Structures are given as structure tokens and as C-alpha cells.
Amino acid sequence: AYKLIKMAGGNSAIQTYAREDKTTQTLSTQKTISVLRNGSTSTRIIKVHINSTAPVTINTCDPTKCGPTVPMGVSFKSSMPEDADPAEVLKAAKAALALFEANLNSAFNKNVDEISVA
Amino acid sequence: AYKLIKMAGGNSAIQTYAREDKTTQTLSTQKTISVLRNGSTSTRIIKVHINSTAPVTINTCDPTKCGPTVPMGVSFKSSMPEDADPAEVLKAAKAALALFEANLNSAFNKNVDEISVA
Amino acid sequence: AYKLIKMAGGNSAIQTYAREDKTTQTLSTQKTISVLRNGSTSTRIIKVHINSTAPVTINTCDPTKCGPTVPMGVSFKSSMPEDADPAEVLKAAKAALALFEANLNSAFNKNVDEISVA
Amino acid sequence: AYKLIKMAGGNSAIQTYAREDKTTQTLSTQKTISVLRNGSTSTRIIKVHINSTAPVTINTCDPTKCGPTVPMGVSFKSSMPEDADPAEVLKAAKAALALFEANLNSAFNKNVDEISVA
Amino acid sequence: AYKLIKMAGGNSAIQTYAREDKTTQTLSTQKTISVLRNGSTSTRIIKVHINSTAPVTINTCDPTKCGPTVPMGVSFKSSMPEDADPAEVLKAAKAALALFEANLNSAFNKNVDEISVA
Amino acid sequence: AYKLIKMAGGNSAIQTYAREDKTTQTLSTQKTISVLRNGSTSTRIIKVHINSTAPVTINTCDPTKCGPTVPMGVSFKSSMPEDADPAEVLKAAKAALALFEANLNSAFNKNVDEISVA
């Protein structure tokens, strides 16, 4: 139960947030608009990028003597024509993620031959 | 209300599925392992990549839904050293996605100053 | 009966908005400052530029409204040295626009010999 | 309460007017027709240009000893396919202008995040 | 009593404001973050910069009564590592400012053997 | 409550003080005068600089528990022509400082659309 407050940042397109408790855990959201034209017609391509990271100490069996840290991260990206419906690709993506997020650190990729979407 | 069946493709430690009824909607899951060495210490880095896309007919002039197709896609990526705990990173990422999910196709960026979690 | 929301673009001291319901209709406002030096004296010149455009499907043969799109646009520009009074210039410009507004698309020029103001 | 009478001018496309009271305040209206063809089809592009200017003396704090003058100007431009409807782009442009015309000389561009159109 | 309205700036790191009555009187706020890497531990260093200026005109007698304009400004700067306590340096700075504030425009300075802090 | 005792400085333009309790916490006051020659009239320009700092130690875990020391500081600067009135720029700067003061050590910043001045 915490909240991520917006950080001072240089870019206007990117919003950066840090966790109130641990200002080492951060999150970043960015939106990009692109233009793709066929002949005379032109359509907008909206791209979203959300990145949540925190540092994690490399050495589990060490005495935690400020061992060099590696970023641990979870990222989300979205690219779609304006006013398209991501509802179904999101449902599918979330269903797939549910199979992995238990084993997101365990180097074990189960052979799944079909994924059921709710 | 549907299921993603593994497509008749060569497994490359990358598993690609298509939706049973709409085989245009696809989804891919891969896990890879890297080795990060800092001095004497070496640690394994688990990297998951899930992708869920469908084609979208460009909003066109015809009453019939006919036009060039642009891919729309939602992608989730995850990189962390083995046996780390991404619980809080995932929680924050999911809260941010909850904020931006309706606006994934909006072409307008909502300026929020804090993101409440858990 | 609608509002122009500022689009998710990088502010360049130029503000670009799109219409909320019809995001094809856009509008841009910029203000710039110049310095005009005549001999010893230097004065600041304020320059405003407002642009309001929408795409227009070319009048075509099909019953469906399908054809190449040409931009239609109305543009207002204003340049004056700082603290000047453009009240009367604006008044005359507005009277002229009132005369020509119905004929902005006419391909016929109305020959008027006087323009009444205020 | 004045009127702009037509001036002697050289061009037939451009109508030039001067104010009766001050023949230093002037106004000019021009209409241009262009042709844009796709394949066999061809369409007219009607462009209107209205420019209202007056000279203004540079030096406010001077004794008004015929200081060199700079033109202060307000301009309007219109470009659209023949028989298109500028009604909405005009409404939007006028709504935007209303925010600026108070501060047309004051070098201050307020951050406006949305413009309401009547 | 007045309000500092936010001006439209291209840079998102700096927020600029102008007084509603006098748009010549302005104020800028900027926060920036620096990383100080000591060994394998990086610490965050927060710098704040507030500036409040307005143009003052130096009247000099002249056949043509226009004199130059030079800004008068009050600036505040701050720099400290994250989660440090500025309470006491603020109190001391404010007491010194209290001594000098009356005489900011006066070119007088007297030896002060001690400054009493609240 | 404490007293800033005057330290013994070689330069007479700058007066330096140290807190009686903590001689590590210091404060400097300096006033300087500049001449601005416009034609045959020279005008006096008063600049004041107050600085209040103290050393803060960044604790970083290490086999040998000694971390580096970096200063935290609050700075005030002022510059204006003689006999000008800073009352309003001071009020505005103080209101902005009042907003940012709590968050001087926090790395958070939220968009503020206006600052209300007393």
C-alpha cells in the first residue's frame, strides 16, 4: 500500500515517478504519436511505453556489503492505429503473462501447447 | 471465451499461438537466459517476452471494412536476475497500465501527478 | 459544443490541439518575439500565428465519401511592436472577413467598393 | 464608425482599400484560384488573403518627433477545395483568436490546455 | 494580491509564470536531479532554482526622453542530497535575508558582528 | 535558537559566519556594486548574495563504514538598480519558495498551473 509521486524530469513526453517509501523503485510512462500515410490518407499511430524498475543486489549469499546492483524491470509497450480496439490483444497478453509471472525469475519455460483466454 | 492454440511452427524455445476462431490474432512467448559477470561474480538474468497482436483494417472511406491493415499489438517484457522478487515492480507496472489502458488509442496524454499502488 | 484538447506533442512554444470528437480537425497557436533595431532604438515585435485546419475529401464520383483528401484551413497572423494598439486594425479585418466569409469557397470574387466598420 | 474606400491599384486580383479618416490605415483582399488534379479529375483550390495594416510610431517615450514607423498588421488566409465547408475551422479559429486578441501585443502566451468552441 | 499565471514554455523542466496584472513581472521554478556515484552506491542530489524578476527603467535626462531597461531580480537556489534536512540552513539564510532585505536597493552595508537565528 | 558568530576572513567584501553550536554550518553575506554607464549618466547596480550551507554525510554500506561528505546549501541572490523597488519580486519569490520548501529534499515535482501571491 504505497503511491508513486511524479519525479522532476527533463522530458515533457515522459512522465517519471518514484515510490514514496523507496525512491529507488521507479516507473515511467511515455506516449508517442506517429503518422502513417497511404496516398492522400493519413492515420495516427499511438505508442505507449510503461517501464517499472528497481535495483536489486546481485549477491544473494553475500553479507549484503553493498554489492553492485542490477536493474530488475517489467515493461509494457503498445502500438496501434488511433481508435483501434486493443481489448482482445490485451486479454490475450494478460492471459499469457499469468502463466509466466510466477516463473518470471526461474529460467524454466514450460511447454504450453494452448493458452485459454477468459 | 476462446483459446490460443500453438501454431504448427518450429519451436525455437519461442512458442507462437494463434486464436482458434480468429487465426489473425496471434501471441508469442519466449524466455531467454543471459549471464552477467561483474568481476569474480556471475549471475543469470531471466528475460521473458510476450507479444499479442492482431491486424487492424485502417479506418477507411468505404462502408465495407476494406483498407490497408496495420498491426496493433500489446507487448510485455521482463528482465531480472535469477531468484529476484519482481512483486512490487509488477504491482506498480499493473497500476500504471490500469491508468493508461483506456488511453492506449487516445492520441491524448493524461497528465497524472501520482499513481496509487496496492 | 466541443473542445480542442492539447495533443500529446512536444511543446515548442507552439501549442497544437486536436478536436476531441473529430481528431482530424486541428489547431495551432504560436507567439514569437523579434527585435527591430533602427539606429539607437530597438523595439520588440510580437507575432501571433493561429491555424485551424481539417482534411476535406475531394468531391468525388462515388456515392461513398471516398477520395483524396486536401487540407482546408483558416489562418490568422498578427505582427505589431510591443504595447501598440491593434484595436482598429482588428476591427477592419473582422469587417472584411465578415464580407468574405460566405465566399471563402466561392471561386467568384465579389467586387465591393467600400467596407463599413464599427 | 468609418468606412474603407477602394484605392487606386495596379493589380486586378487584389482590391486595396484605405480608411476615409486616416488614409494611412489600409486593407487588402485577394482571391487566387488554383487547380489540383488527380489522374483525370481536377478540383479548384480557392485561396483568400485579407491584410489590415497601419503604421505605428516606434518610440513610445519619445516626443513623437516623427520617429521611424513600423507596420502593425493583422492578416487572414483561407485555402480550401471549392464548395468545401469552412464553418467549423472558422469557428475554431475565431475561438482561438479570442484568447489571443487581448494579449496580441504583450509577449505573454498563456499555457492553455484546452480551448472550448461554442 | 495577484496570481502568477503559467506561461507556455517548451522546456518541461522549467515552469515559467507571469503576473496577471503585469505580464512583465515573471517567475521561474526549476528542479533538477544529479547522480553522485560513490563506489557501487549512487546518491540523488536535488537542486532547486527559483527566479523572480521584473524590468526597471533607468530614467536619464536626454533630449529624447527614453532610457534603458535593466532587470531587477531575486533568486533562490538550493542543492542537497536526497532526504537531507535543510531546516537549519533555511532558518539561517532567512535571518540573514531579513537583515539585508530592507537594504537590497540601497548600496549601504555595515559591519555585522553576529546574526541571531530564531 | 543559536547565533552565527563572525568568522575571521581576509576579504572584507564577504562576511562569513559559523553557527556557535555547529561550526560546520556556515553562512556568507556579500554586497557588491556595479556601474552601468548609459551615455553621460552612470547608474548604480546593487547585487546581494547570501549563502547558508552545512555538510551532510551520505551513508553507504561498506566493509569500512566511512562515506563521503557533500554540502547542502540554500542560496539567495539579488540584483537591481539603486533605489528600485523589490517588494513585489520578493513577495512572488517567497510564495514560490513557500510551495517548494517542504519538497526541497524530495525529488518530487507536480505541475502547478498558478501561484497565488499574498
XYZ file of C-alpha atoms in Angstrom:
708
model
C 0.000 0.000 0.000
C 2.063 2.938 -1.351
C 1.961 5.599 -4.056
C 4.329 6.750 -6.799
C 4.777 10.515 -6.858
C 5.948 12.293 -10.000
C 9.687 12.992 -10.170
C 11.463 16.015 -11.556
C 12.232 15.142 -15.167
C 13.640 16.840 -18.228
C 11.435 15.440 -20.994
C 7.834 16.586 -21.475
C 6.638 13.416 -23.245
C 7.958 11.123 -20.491
C 6.414 11.162 -17.015
C 8.729 9.708 -14.367
C 7.517 8.609 -10.931
C 9.265 7.296 -7.842
C 7.846 5.329 -4.950
C 7.302 7.369 -1.803
C 8.695 4.707 0.564
C 11.639 3.658 -1.628
C 12.710 6.378 -4.026
C 14.862 3.667 -5.673
C 11.828 1.974 -7.214
C 10.711 3.997 -10.226
C 8.181 3.960 -13.065
C 7.989 5.798 -16.387
C 5.173 6.356 -18.884
C 5.646 7.775 -22.374
C 3.264 8.389 -25.272
C 4.443 8.866 -28.861
C 2.299 9.816 -31.848
C 3.407 8.818 -35.350
C 1.886 9.450 -38.774
C 1.476 6.767 -41.433
C 0.042 7.864 -44.772
C -1.120 5.793 -47.742
C -1.506 8.052 -50.755
C -3.544 11.008 -49.550
C -4.974 9.336 -46.441
C -3.020 9.572 -43.195
C -3.579 7.863 -39.846
C -2.133 8.264 -36.363
C -0.147 5.515 -34.661
C -0.278 5.811 -30.870
C 2.567 4.139 -28.974
C 2.631 3.800 -25.175
C 5.594 2.663 -23.080
C 5.429 1.885 -19.347
C 8.581 0.754 -17.532
C 8.751 -0.215 -13.839
C 12.187 -0.937 -12.364
C 14.036 -1.244 -9.101
C 17.663 -2.077 -8.344
C 18.408 -5.487 -6.878
C 21.653 -6.576 -5.206
C 23.495 -9.224 -7.229
C 24.850 -11.442 -4.489
C 22.272 -13.453 -2.559
C 24.774 -15.405 -0.413
C 26.937 -12.315 0.324
C 26.794 -10.346 3.609
C 24.972 -7.596 1.644
C 28.113 -5.408 1.682
C 26.707 -3.036 -0.974
C 27.290 -5.495 -3.785
C 26.908 -3.939 -7.229
C 23.248 -3.781 -8.200
C 21.482 -4.774 -11.400
C 18.183 -3.234 -12.560
C 15.178 -5.557 -12.338
C 12.459 -4.428 -14.694
C 8.984 -5.063 -16.055
C 7.987 -3.258 -19.245
C 4.826 -2.784 -21.301
C 4.572 -1.427 -24.843
C 1.555 -0.636 -27.021
C 1.412 0.349 -30.700
C -1.872 0.743 -32.529
C -3.729 2.896 -35.047
C -5.772 5.630 -33.381
C -9.233 4.486 -32.219
C -8.407 0.790 -32.686
C -9.589 -1.726 -30.093
C -6.787 -3.326 -28.036
C -9.337 -5.128 -25.854
C -8.688 -8.581 -27.305
C -4.891 -8.377 -27.687
C -4.794 -7.119 -24.090
C -6.929 -10.022 -22.838
C -4.633 -12.463 -24.656
C -1.442 -10.777 -23.449
C -2.664 -10.798 -19.838
C -3.657 -14.468 -20.078
C -0.188 -15.322 -21.388
C 1.513 -13.243 -18.695
C -0.410 -15.065 -15.953
C 1.425 -18.257 -16.995
C 4.845 -16.595 -16.724
C 4.671 -14.217 -13.782
C 5.059 -16.988 -11.220
C 8.202 -18.167 -13.055
C 9.494 -14.723 -14.091
C 12.837 -15.381 -12.356
C 13.221 -19.151 -12.551
C 14.703 -19.834 -16.017
C 12.031 -22.521 -16.585
C 9.834 -22.150 -19.679
C 7.055 -24.735 -19.559
C 5.959 -26.241 -22.870
C 2.441 -24.869 -23.252
C 0.577 -26.061 -26.346
C -2.533 -23.919 -25.801
C -3.417 -20.853 -23.730
C -7.042 -20.390 -22.659
C -8.306 -16.791 -22.742
C -11.182 -15.868 -20.434
C -14.296 -17.411 -24.222
C -11.653 -18.665 -26.699
C -8.279 -20.393 -26.645
C -4.930 -19.691 -28.298
C -3.692 -22.909 -29.890
C 0.021 -23.409 -30.546
C 0.567 -22.980 -34.248
C 2.202 -25.583 -36.477
C 5.561 -23.843 -36.319
C 9.060 -24.924 -35.434
C 9.559 -24.453 -31.699
C 12.652 -22.264 -31.257
C 12.298 -22.011 -27.470
C 9.799 -19.399 -28.734
C 6.167 -20.532 -28.635
C 3.745 -18.921 -31.086
C -0.023 -19.381 -30.787
C -2.961 -18.267 -32.902
C -6.518 -17.735 -31.724
C -8.737 -20.672 -32.604
C -11.649 -18.789 -34.195
C -9.816 -15.652 -35.394
C -6.479 -17.039 -36.567
C -5.397 -13.487 -37.468
C -4.885 -12.751 -33.772
C -1.583 -14.211 -32.585
C 0.568 -14.310 -29.444
C 4.214 -15.259 -28.824
C 6.053 -16.148 -25.609
C 9.813 -16.604 -25.265
C 12.158 -16.924 -22.297
C 15.914 -16.428 -22.617
C 18.797 -16.618 -20.153
C 21.793 -14.271 -20.076
C 24.926 -14.314 -17.913
C 26.071 -11.021 -16.368
C 29.617 -11.110 -14.972
C 30.928 -8.317 -12.728
C 34.447 -9.225 -11.648
C 34.504 -12.635 -9.969
C 30.718 -12.888 -9.663
C 28.469 -14.111 -12.477
C 24.669 -14.182 -12.267
C 21.905 -15.443 -14.542
C 19.375 -12.985 -15.972
C 15.911 -14.277 -16.924
C 14.220 -12.380 -19.769
C 10.570 -13.014 -20.703
C 8.928 -11.509 -23.787
C 5.196 -11.851 -24.524
C 3.589 -10.293 -27.597
C -0.102 -10.204 -28.548
C -1.053 -8.714 -31.919
C -3.907 -8.571 -34.389
C -4.262 -6.804 -37.732
C -6.471 -3.713 -37.840
C -8.103 -2.506 -41.036
C -7.227 1.172 -41.394
C -10.245 3.389 -40.845
C -11.249 3.922 -44.456
C -13.827 5.659 -46.608
C -15.742 2.588 -47.820
C -18.821 1.325 -45.962
C -17.327 -2.138 -46.358
C -14.470 -2.631 -43.895
C -11.757 -2.619 -46.561
C -8.397 -0.873 -46.380
C -4.703 -1.445 -45.691
C -4.063 -3.359 -42.468
C -1.714 -2.037 -39.781
C -0.705 -4.354 -36.910
C -1.902 -3.451 -33.428
C -0.046 -5.057 -30.579
C 0.436 -5.208 -26.842
C 3.838 -6.359 -25.611
C 5.139 -7.276 -22.152
C 8.861 -7.648 -21.427
C 10.558 -8.667 -18.175
C 14.262 -8.833 -17.282
C 15.632 -9.634 -13.845
C 18.470 -11.626 -12.274
C 17.550 -15.147 -11.211
C 15.580 -15.612 -7.956
C 14.877 -11.876 -7.591
C 11.427 -10.728 -6.419
C 9.603 -8.604 -9.038
C 6.400 -8.486 -6.957
C 6.424 -4.741 -6.350
C 7.709 -3.893 -9.829
C 4.829 -5.905 -11.317
C 2.343 -4.259 -8.952
C 3.410 -0.738 -9.984
C 3.512 -1.641 -13.678
C -0.019 -3.042 -13.433
C -1.294 0.106 -11.686
C 0.197 2.302 -14.419
C -1.283 0.101 -17.139
C -4.652 0.356 -15.399
C -4.381 4.136 -15.656
C -3.353 4.174 -19.338
C -5.382 1.212 -20.680
C -8.402 3.225 -21.829
C -5.990 5.745 -23.406
C -3.873 3.210 -25.306
C -5.556 4.514 -28.502
C -6.341 8.084 -27.460
C -3.668 10.354 -29.056
C -4.055 12.479 -25.894
C -1.741 12.088 -22.913
C -3.328 12.315 -19.465
C -1.014 14.274 -17.157
C -1.243 12.483 -13.798
C 0.977 13.542 -10.894
C 0.758 10.371 -8.773
C -0.035 6.679 -9.240
C -1.521 4.774 -6.291
C -0.437 1.151 -5.810
C -1.583 -1.863 -3.729
C -20.260 22.333 -28.479
C -16.800 20.686 -28.448
C -13.322 21.368 -27.099
C -9.844 21.325 -28.627
C -7.563 19.326 -26.341
C -3.805 19.900 -26.417
C -2.267 16.979 -28.233
C 0.451 14.761 -26.783
C 3.184 16.646 -28.600
C 6.398 18.310 -27.551
C 5.644 21.919 -26.638
C 7.954 24.105 -28.744
C 6.433 27.387 -27.542
C 3.958 26.238 -30.230
C 0.771 24.676 -28.856
C -1.073 22.187 -31.066
C -4.583 20.972 -30.230
C -6.908 18.436 -31.812
C -10.687 18.385 -31.584
C -11.900 15.882 -29.018
C -14.514 14.064 -31.120
C -13.074 14.669 -34.612
C -9.332 14.371 -34.030
C -8.765 15.107 -37.738
C -9.549 18.770 -37.084
C -6.535 20.510 -35.556
C -5.455 23.996 -34.468
C -2.052 25.520 -33.650
C -1.128 28.708 -31.779
C 2.366 30.190 -31.527
C 3.723 33.522 -30.315
C 7.221 34.728 -31.190
C 9.204 37.848 -30.328
C 11.502 39.732 -32.709
C 13.780 42.723 -32.114
C 13.720 45.547 -34.677
C 16.624 47.996 -34.358
C 16.609 51.330 -36.212
C 19.747 53.228 -35.250
C 19.980 53.624 -31.477
C 16.409 52.474 -30.828
C 15.405 48.814 -30.564
C 11.814 47.633 -30.118
C 10.177 44.252 -29.578
C 7.755 42.896 -32.181
C 5.071 40.420 -31.065
C 3.970 37.937 -33.743
C 0.977 35.622 -33.213
C 0.072 32.819 -35.620
C -3.117 30.743 -35.282
C -4.003 27.980 -37.738
C -7.175 25.869 -37.879
C -7.346 23.053 -40.435
C -9.291 19.923 -41.258
C -8.971 17.431 -44.107
C -11.619 17.552 -46.830
C -12.421 14.558 -49.006
C -12.236 15.741 -52.609
C -15.660 15.871 -54.217
C -15.615 12.517 -55.972
C -17.721 10.277 -58.173
C -18.524 7.545 -55.631
C -21.699 7.682 -53.528
C -19.492 6.746 -50.590
C -17.470 9.758 -49.445
C -14.141 8.380 -50.664
C -11.414 10.288 -52.478
C -8.062 12.013 -51.986
C -8.052 14.452 -49.069
C -6.937 18.068 -49.480
C -6.395 20.199 -46.350
C -8.740 23.126 -45.797
C -7.547 25.765 -43.399
C -8.191 29.169 -41.909
C -5.159 31.080 -40.659
C -4.804 34.282 -38.628
C -1.477 36.113 -38.309
C -0.670 39.240 -36.293
C 2.548 41.278 -36.103
C 2.952 44.523 -34.194
C 5.524 46.263 -31.992
C 5.055 45.736 -28.268
C 2.332 47.749 -26.471
C 0.816 49.026 -29.735
C -2.983 49.206 -30.088
C -4.323 46.947 -32.881
C -7.959 47.682 -31.962
C -8.873 49.432 -35.203
C -6.797 47.103 -37.383
C -8.629 44.130 -35.846
C -11.990 45.860 -36.292
C -11.392 46.467 -40.017
C -10.004 42.967 -40.562
C -13.087 41.485 -38.894
C -15.434 43.583 -41.056
C -13.664 42.417 -44.221
C -13.782 38.795 -43.079
C -17.497 39.216 -42.400
C -17.926 40.306 -46.013
C -15.867 37.447 -47.498
C -16.760 34.597 -45.096
C -19.633 33.170 -47.145
C -17.417 33.450 -50.254
C -14.363 31.711 -48.783
C -15.232 28.729 -51.044
C -16.994 30.519 -53.896
C -14.479 30.793 -56.801
C -16.218 34.120 -57.562
C -14.880 37.429 -56.276
C -17.443 39.969 -55.079
C -16.375 43.445 -56.217
C -17.239 45.737 -53.294
C -16.257 49.413 -53.371
C -16.463 50.175 -49.632
C -16.319 48.295 -46.326
C -18.209 49.747 -43.351
C -16.615 49.383 -39.906
C -17.703 49.834 -36.256
C -17.567 54.388 -37.142
C -15.766 54.821 -40.502
C -15.549 53.231 -43.942
C -12.727 51.970 -46.157
C -12.975 53.258 -49.715
C -11.272 51.434 -52.574
C -7.842 52.776 -53.541
C -6.317 53.107 -56.974
C -4.372 49.895 -57.505
C -2.456 48.199 -60.278
C -3.452 44.556 -59.815
C -6.896 43.267 -60.810
C -6.919 40.292 -58.410
C -6.077 42.455 -55.377
C -8.558 45.022 -54.065
C -6.904 47.697 -51.920
C -8.855 49.980 -49.584
C -7.889 52.897 -47.375
C -9.716 54.355 -44.410
C -11.526 57.603 -45.146
C -10.433 59.332 -41.917
C -6.835 58.061 -41.923
C -5.618 57.159 -45.387
C -2.619 55.576 -43.599
C -4.702 52.645 -42.368
C -5.228 50.236 -45.255
C -6.757 46.848 -46.064
C -6.291 44.421 -48.952
C -8.296 41.427 -50.174
C -7.080 38.945 -52.777
C -8.571 35.761 -54.225
C -6.493 33.135 -56.034
C -7.794 30.059 -57.841
C -5.539 27.019 -58.242
C -6.069 23.668 -59.952
C -5.182 20.325 -58.378
C -5.740 17.227 -60.498
C -5.576 13.547 -59.553
C -5.459 11.460 -62.710
C -8.266 12.768 -64.892
C -10.220 14.507 -62.126
C -9.389 18.122 -61.316
C -10.591 20.359 -58.488
C -10.335 24.062 -57.712
C -8.475 25.378 -54.678
C -9.770 28.784 -53.588
C -7.358 30.904 -51.545
C -8.356 34.183 -49.873
C -5.990 36.688 -48.265
C -7.106 39.693 -46.193
C -4.479 42.016 -44.705
C -5.234 45.039 -42.491
C -2.314 47.284 -41.525
C -1.488 50.709 -40.196
C 1.842 52.349 -39.397
C 2.730 52.825 -35.747
C 5.476 55.064 -34.355
C 8.284 53.064 -32.739
C 9.149 55.251 -29.784
C 6.527 55.449 -27.044
C 8.596 57.585 -24.630
C 9.845 59.948 -27.390
C 8.383 63.431 -28.038
C 6.754 61.939 -31.178
C 9.290 63.732 -33.415
C 8.323 61.650 -36.481
C 10.147 58.581 -35.236
C 10.522 55.893 -37.892
C 7.348 53.839 -38.138
C 6.817 50.090 -38.239
C 3.785 48.425 -39.864
C 1.324 46.867 -37.416
C -0.737 44.212 -39.127
C -3.478 41.624 -38.788
C -3.801 39.028 -41.542
C -6.244 36.282 -42.505
C -5.683 33.487 -45.019
C -8.015 30.781 -46.330
C -7.242 27.785 -48.556
C -9.853 25.173 -49.353
C -11.244 22.990 -52.134
C -14.150 24.635 -53.945
C -17.531 24.125 -52.227
C -15.946 22.826 -49.009
C -17.361 23.925 -45.658
C -15.049 26.196 -43.621
C -17.757 26.693 -40.989
C -16.092 24.538 -38.338
C -12.455 25.556 -38.922
C -13.655 29.172 -38.812
C -15.499 28.638 -35.514
C -12.364 27.038 -34.049
C -10.035 29.725 -35.403
C -12.243 32.501 -34.008
C -12.436 30.791 -30.609
C -8.639 30.542 -30.519
C -8.218 34.161 -31.606
C -10.499 35.362 -28.798
C -7.889 34.055 -26.323
C -5.065 35.983 -28.005
C -6.529 39.281 -29.156
C -6.417 40.807 -25.684
C -2.713 39.879 -25.456
C -1.821 40.487 -29.123
C 0.922 42.953 -28.116
C 2.024 41.721 -24.701
C 4.564 38.938 -25.405
C 2.713 36.680 -22.927
C 1.498 33.308 -24.230
C -0.674 31.653 -21.591
C -0.449 27.872 -21.299
C -3.887 26.771 -22.475
C -4.504 23.019 -22.345
C -7.971 23.120 -23.934
C -9.971 25.622 -25.986
C -13.771 25.485 -25.788
C -15.587 26.118 -29.084
C -19.134 27.475 -28.921
C -2.981 40.198 -4.208
C -2.351 38.662 -7.638
C -1.824 35.345 -9.431
C 1.251 34.150 -11.325
C -0.287 32.551 -14.432
C 1.711 29.766 -16.074
C 3.336 30.813 -19.341
C 3.623 28.376 -22.237
C 7.168 27.023 -22.228
C 8.827 24.495 -24.484
C 11.041 23.079 -21.736
C 9.231 20.915 -19.188
C 11.976 21.043 -16.541
C 11.377 24.792 -16.057
C 7.944 26.217 -15.241
C 7.587 29.913 -16.065
C 4.859 32.232 -14.782
C 3.878 35.848 -15.365
C 1.871 38.084 -13.068
C -1.704 38.620 -14.211
C -1.595 42.403 -13.712
C 1.917 42.929 -15.107
C 2.934 40.253 -17.571
C 6.387 41.898 -17.437
C 6.985 40.569 -13.926
C 7.904 36.901 -14.205
C 8.956 33.942 -12.068
C 10.584 30.608 -12.923
C 10.793 27.387 -10.915
C 13.111 24.517 -11.831
C 14.056 21.293 -10.061
C 16.865 19.092 -11.362
C 18.356 15.819 -10.135
C 22.006 14.725 -10.215
C 23.574 11.326 -9.519
C 26.630 11.140 -7.256
C 28.246 7.714 -7.611
C 30.408 6.699 -4.643
C 31.696 3.186 -5.264
C 28.721 0.943 -6.001
C 26.224 3.308 -4.326
C 24.679 6.209 -6.234
C 23.036 9.028 -4.269
C 20.486 11.517 -5.544
C 21.192 15.269 -5.366
C 18.256 17.676 -5.664
C 18.787 21.232 -6.934
C 16.011 23.849 -6.936
C 16.170 27.241 -8.661
C 13.509 29.953 -8.284
C 13.909 33.309 -10.030
C 11.602 36.340 -9.751
C 12.379 39.344 -11.954
C 10.811 42.431 -13.449
C 12.179 45.156 -15.737
C 13.046 48.528 -14.177
C 13.680 51.592 -16.351
C 16.629 53.847 -15.502
C 15.452 57.391 -16.206
C 18.298 59.509 -17.591
C 17.713 63.057 -18.772
C 18.077 63.340 -22.542
C 16.706 65.499 -25.381
C 14.769 62.357 -26.316
C 13.342 61.041 -23.033
C 13.808 57.282 -23.443
C 16.190 55.474 -21.113
C 17.371 51.867 -20.996
C 15.711 48.962 -19.222
C 17.564 46.581 -16.902
C 16.065 43.710 -14.860
C 15.704 43.615 -11.103
C 15.693 40.086 -9.780
C 15.528 37.972 -6.662
C 16.931 34.459 -6.966
C 16.801 31.416 -4.692
C 18.955 28.337 -5.218
C 19.129 25.087 -3.265
C 21.238 21.921 -3.535
C 21.390 18.944 -1.209
C 21.473 15.139 -1.146
C 18.127 13.386 -1.088
C 16.412 13.092 2.311
C 18.756 15.643 3.911
C 17.448 18.231 6.378
C 17.630 21.876 5.199
C 15.605 23.242 8.115
C 18.506 24.990 9.810
C 20.324 26.345 6.738
C 16.931 27.728 5.691
C 16.405 29.400 9.083
C 19.884 30.968 8.958
C 19.564 32.116 5.346
C 16.171 33.627 6.157
C 17.586 35.542 9.141
C 20.398 36.969 7.000
C 17.885 37.872 4.292
C 15.800 39.577 6.969
C 18.795 41.771 7.781
C 19.621 42.636 4.167
C 16.097 42.827 2.686
C 15.344 46.462 3.531
C 18.712 47.487 2.050
C 18.568 45.464 -1.193
C 18.319 48.661 -3.271
C 20.488 50.957 -1.161
C 24.244 50.274 -1.706
C 24.837 50.561 2.065
C 26.422 47.853 4.181
C 27.540 47.960 7.818
C 29.743 45.503 9.682
C 27.590 42.950 11.488
C 29.407 41.017 14.190
C 26.674 38.414 14.626
C 23.346 37.278 13.201
C 20.769 35.956 15.661
C 18.749 32.998 14.373
C 15.252 32.197 15.669
C 17.917 29.305 18.956
C 21.571 29.975 18.109
C 23.979 32.703 16.987
C 26.013 32.880 13.778
C 29.406 34.094 15.039
C 31.530 36.056 12.575
C 34.490 34.086 11.246
C 37.809 35.794 10.552
C 38.000 36.412 6.813
C 40.683 38.070 4.742
C 38.229 39.551 2.243
C 36.200 42.488 3.550
C 33.527 42.363 0.830
C 32.317 38.973 2.131
C 31.301 38.429 5.758
C 31.378 34.783 6.838
C 29.712 33.338 9.936
C 29.581 29.936 11.609
C 26.924 28.634 13.964
C 28.007 28.581 17.596
C 26.761 25.024 18.208
C 27.955 23.564 14.893
C 30.883 25.446 13.427
C 30.356 23.226 10.354
C 27.169 25.088 9.443
C 28.156 28.378 7.838
C 26.631 31.445 6.194
C 28.102 34.164 3.970
C 26.774 37.619 3.104
C 28.197 39.745 0.295
C 27.088 43.013 -1.290
C 28.747 44.326 -4.446
C 28.169 47.428 -6.564
C 28.394 47.758 -10.354
C 28.360 50.861 -12.560
C 26.119 50.901 -15.639
C 27.119 53.809 -17.879
C 24.371 54.959 -20.254
C 25.654 57.961 -22.183
C 26.883 60.543 -19.683
C 24.819 59.087 -16.809
C 26.140 56.218 -14.697
C 23.684 54.219 -12.580
C 24.487 52.066 -9.573
C 23.551 48.359 -9.545
C 23.420 46.554 -6.194
C 23.945 42.783 -6.003
C 23.479 40.805 -2.777
C 24.489 37.170 -2.243
C 23.631 35.154 0.883
C 24.665 31.504 1.173
C 23.832 29.092 4.015
C 25.376 25.618 3.876
C 26.256 22.656 6.038
C 27.927 19.318 5.268
C 25.710 16.221 5.037
C 27.216 12.722 5.049
C 25.877 10.157 2.575
C 25.882 6.838 4.427
C 26.761 3.979 2.071
C 27.223 0.446 3.352
C 30.853 -0.648 3.124
C 33.229 -3.023 4.942
C 34.809 0.183 6.255
C 31.885 2.377 7.336
C 33.027 5.817 6.161
C 31.058 7.559 3.429
C 31.639 10.819 1.574
C 30.514 14.284 2.605
C 28.678 16.678 0.283
C 27.280 20.131 1.160
C 23.626 21.042 1.422
C 23.033 24.699 0.725
C 20.403 27.383 0.417
C 21.375 30.426 -1.630
C 19.756 33.829 -2.135
C 20.844 36.266 -4.832
C 19.574 39.745 -5.668
C 20.429 42.326 -8.343
C 18.742 45.619 -9.112
C 19.438 49.272 -9.929
C 19.795 51.613 -6.987
C 16.557 52.905 -5.427
C 14.435 50.321 -7.266
C 11.528 48.579 -5.532
C 11.952 44.806 -4.985
C 8.862 44.467 -2.791
C 6.796 42.564 -5.334
C 9.500 40.300 -6.795
C 10.317 39.418 -3.179
C 6.670 38.589 -2.408
C 6.412 36.386 -5.515
C 9.728 34.625 -4.909
C 8.698 33.989 -1.305
C 5.366 32.473 -2.382
C 7.123 30.132 -4.822
C 9.645 29.208 -2.130
C 6.723 28.507 0.190
C 5.432 25.983 -2.339
C 8.784 24.273 -2.912
C 10.266 24.473 0.612
C 8.728 21.295 2.035
C 9.908 19.365 -1.042
C 13.493 20.689 -1.227
C 14.895 17.251 -0.325
C 12.328 15.048 -2.051
C 12.925 14.870 -5.858
C 9.161 15.232 -6.458
C 7.598 17.951 -8.578
C 3.990 18.356 -9.725
C 2.611 20.663 -12.398
C 1.394 23.892 -10.812
C -0.904 25.938 -13.022
C -0.759 29.053 -10.852
C 0.929 30.502 -7.777
C -1.168 32.760 -5.554
C 0.725 35.735 -4.117
C -0.317 37.438 -0.866
